[PDB]
Amino acid sequence: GVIDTSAVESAITDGQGDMKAIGGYIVGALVILAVAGLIYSMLRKA
Known part of the structure; x- marks a missing residue:
């Protein structure tokens, strides 16, 4: 009959x-595939 020690289990x-x-x-x-997109950004010339 515990209302807190047992909560952790x-x-x-x-x-x-x-x-x-x-x-x-x-x-x-x-997430790794989005990183490749930066290569196209070279075309932006920024």
């Missing part, structure tokens, strides 16, 4: 399992 128990493991790699690849 709840977060661990409920950390977050739902496509977060495989899904995290998919978003990471999108």
Whole structure:
């Protein structure tokens, strides 16, 4: 019958399992591709 010591286990128990493991790699690849776009910026002459 605890209303706070047990809460800390709840977060661990409920950390977050739902496509977060495989899904995290998919978003990471999108960020590297945006970096290549800067090369076209040379045409801007800035």
